Amino acid sequence: LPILGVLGGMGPVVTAEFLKSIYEYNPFIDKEQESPNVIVFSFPSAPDRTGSIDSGKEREFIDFIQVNLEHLNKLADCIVIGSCTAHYALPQIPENLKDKLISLIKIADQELQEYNEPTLLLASTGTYQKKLFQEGCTTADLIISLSESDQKLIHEMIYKVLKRGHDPLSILRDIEALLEKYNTRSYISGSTEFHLLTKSLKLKGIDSIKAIDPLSTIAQNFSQLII
Amino acid sequence: LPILGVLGGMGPVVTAEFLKSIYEYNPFIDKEQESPNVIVFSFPSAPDRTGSIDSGKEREFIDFIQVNLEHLNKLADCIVIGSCTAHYALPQIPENLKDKLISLIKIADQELQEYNEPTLLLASTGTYQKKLFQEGCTTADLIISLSESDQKLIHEMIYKVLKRGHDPLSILRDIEALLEKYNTRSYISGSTEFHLLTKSLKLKGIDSIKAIDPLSTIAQNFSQLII
Numbered sequence A, B: 001l002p003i004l005g006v007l008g009g010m011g012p013v014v015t016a017e018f019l020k021s022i023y024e025y026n027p028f029i030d031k032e033q034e035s036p037n038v039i040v041f042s043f044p045s046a047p048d049r050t051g052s053i054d055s056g057k058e059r060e061f062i063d064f065i066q067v068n069l070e071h072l073n074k075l076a077d078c079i080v081i082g083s084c085t086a087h088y089a090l091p092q093i094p095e096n097l098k099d100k101l102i103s104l105i106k107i108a109d110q111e112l113q114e115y116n117e118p119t120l121l122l123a124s125t126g127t128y129q130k131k132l133f134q135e136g137c138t139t140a141d142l143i144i145s146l147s148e149s150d151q152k153l154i155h156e157m158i159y160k161v162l163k164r165g166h167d168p169l170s171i172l173r174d175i176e177a178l179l180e181k182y183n184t185r186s187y188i189s190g191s192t193e194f195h196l197l198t199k200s201l202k203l204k205g206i207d208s209i210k211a212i213d214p215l216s217t218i219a220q221n222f223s224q225l226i227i
Ligand SMILES: N[C@H](CC(=O)O)C(=O)O
Pocket: A010, A011, A048, A049, A050, A082, A083, A084, A085, A086, A124, A127, A190, A191, A192, A193
């Protein structure tokens, strides 16, 4: 049977919610033996991703990712890292451990190709600084980049609201204002913590915003993707 | 840093919710590097626990638990199995793999000693048949056992409602009626799926019922228990 391995804890709140999403979107028909097999390493003790970018101890962070990829390579058939920012480590990791990896950057890119409309990349300054989406996406011309001022406001939303488990709907007004400002009906979850907002919107039946949210997509399409 | 290993997927819905509970009840102060480190094996492909009791393939089920305990023994400092029923396998597993194990039966027993009032064991027929609580708890005289008719109604709640992810509050009326019938203000989560009801009650501020719910307790007391 096909096993998904999640290297998560980045942050833990969204890591936990992602696991809920998997079984929410893959309900069983008769017996729960049908349902997805998943291994989660929720290690919040990973050194902060955006924090490690402003240090010589990117090295420390890349080691974290490498050792845990070694462990999960032995245990899982596909792997996901529960942080977009964290994908910056991948050029330093040997090609063999990235064999099973399913990139959140690539998943985002596939969705955006199908959607084919300008879309606002909501992400941390560190994700922006590492230019993961602009360098990684075939659809980069459809990505609207936040200004530096708005990047910091998003960083503030992620850390002061979403990572601390507060109601993701509490930032919806600020987000509609950004979408309205940058003149788009659509966002990319450049930070995985926007999985939490994506869920709260779907739950509330707000279908006016189009979320390109890789963790949602991985959950929805678990049967097809994991083999 | 201290790592909790969860052998779960039994069922997956409650396994996912338990991981949410851990970070809900252990919010970080400044940085999320503070937060709990957890490994989850959510394998719903485990053969049904109550189902395996009515077969010669208890053997198949005990092997599942043993191999996964071997894996988690190498990776974690404490282990929990996310099924009460599943604890029936433990007499067959060698003492060395049970070193790190934190029994849900024992955790329930500790809580009930402190509470010290008659309490209704809500559980599957298979948990009842294996007599895990009556044989395992020092406080067994405080446990009120369901009749066989009511055991089947609970089995129906677990499988038709809670395991399929439906609103745990949808069974609250039926549960108040059982507590009222057996003349008590208190239940034991003999099935782990009653973690889901315990959460939905705490969220709704219903403090009239006292839940002896081991997964809640493990989450609340993560710092103290995990070392
Ligand atoms: N939430 C992660 C960054 C992190 O907090 O590690 C991301 O995808 O951007």
